[PDB]
């Protein structure tokens, strides 16, 4: 990620994350895209395809806010996004999710990538009962110490621009997010999982630099909208 790209992204506090495998009505998408969120991120687990990413991105391009793709696989990578976020799932037991899939993507597209718009994210999946934990083969048996060690790894050795604490499916352990933040300095802390109110949004946004809100969008659009009130 370039210095200008991180200057812009460091200002973001709230991102609405859309799963292209899910359907979202025009009314709901319009409410999301016209809201006070800082950016829309397309991301999913399995079932992220060229067709469904194309279909969703085409509807979102009708709006001016930043649109980013969290790359899930090679098939769905495509031009047109403002930034590309690439997870390396640090607690995955499978190298495909560390850099194996990335390697294949770089072989295919490396010739023409603008790496200043690519943000490599150190991702730690923390909820066992989630499609992302199952999909990424994550080891979720993690203690606060494990998380602090991953935070030191990301901030001091890899020095990645973003560490993403992912609790997809439930509201996370606030003390753990706090513990991780104490080790992050130049790396931004993104947190996602279970946020469905102004209060949960505010609580996690007081610790993380940027909160990611996703599932609530499909369950209660008005509750989703309250999450931008940080």
């Amino acid at each position: 990620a370039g210095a200008g790209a991180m200057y812009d992204i460091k200002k973001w506090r709230h991102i609405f994350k859309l799963d292209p495998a899910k359907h979202i009505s025009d009314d709901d998408l319009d409410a999301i895209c016209m809201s006070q969120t800082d950016a829309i991120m397309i991301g999913g687990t399995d079932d992220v395809t060229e067709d469904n990413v194309i279909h969703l991105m085409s509807k979102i391009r009708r709006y001016p806010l930043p649109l980013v793709l969290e790359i899930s696989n090679i098939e769905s990578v495509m031009p047109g996004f403002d930034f590309y976020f690439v997870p390396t799932v640090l607690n995955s037991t499978d190298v495909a999710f560390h850099n194996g899939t990335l390697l294949e993507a770089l072989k295919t597209y490396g010739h023409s990538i603008d790496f200043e718009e690519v943000i490599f994210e150190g991702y730690v999946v923390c909820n066992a009962d989630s499609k992302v934990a199952k999909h990424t083969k994550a080891n979720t048996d993690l203690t606060t110490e494990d998380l602090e060690a991953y935070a030191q790894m990301v901030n001091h050795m890899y020095r990645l621009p973003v560490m993403y604490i992912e609790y997809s499916g439930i509201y996370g352990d606030v003390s753990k997010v706090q513990a991780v933040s104490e080790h992050l300095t130049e790396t931004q802390l993104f947190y996602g999982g279970g946020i469905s109110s102004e209060q949960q949004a505010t609580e996690m946004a007081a610790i993380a630099d940027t909160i990611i809100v996703g599932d609530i969008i499909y369950k209660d659009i008005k509750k989703a909208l309250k999450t931008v009130k940080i």
Copy 2:
């Protein structure tokens, strides 16, 4: 302070395997050579002795930490490998996670240099040990070079051919994608000819085995051309 501790200026490093034997005379010869640093790759007692001798000379002494048992004070820098083409997460960051849980409170990270390794010799011990994918085409290596330089943005990419001399066109292809990341090359350098050919591509060559096989040839490996 000085060019001496600036890793970006180093062109040649003699790498010692503390499990191997080296005479005091041969060690002094290495230490008084124009190499830029000595790198040691828990046989702790030979290591403490080894360090005591090298410290009689004004040259950087660094430790490459291979396992959690390698942890140890007294070095100028601590180089930590991540084997990017390993098929086992322990060698990407699993072992590193355990080491940080144990020692992360006591480490000064400014002295730690993370090395993005690509192990290239199928018939080597490290490849077997790390379960490395060594079926690398030039395109595979170019993609790992982009990954290290642009995504992980590590300070060092280390191409390791272990006991054999590698493929110059592949090391060349790699070098073309590296800008801020320094290229270390190690593998079978046993002559001034080989040292010179690789040092014209890599930023720093690492010379190890020849030290134990023929000290005279090893000493000739410091004769390279200007960068």
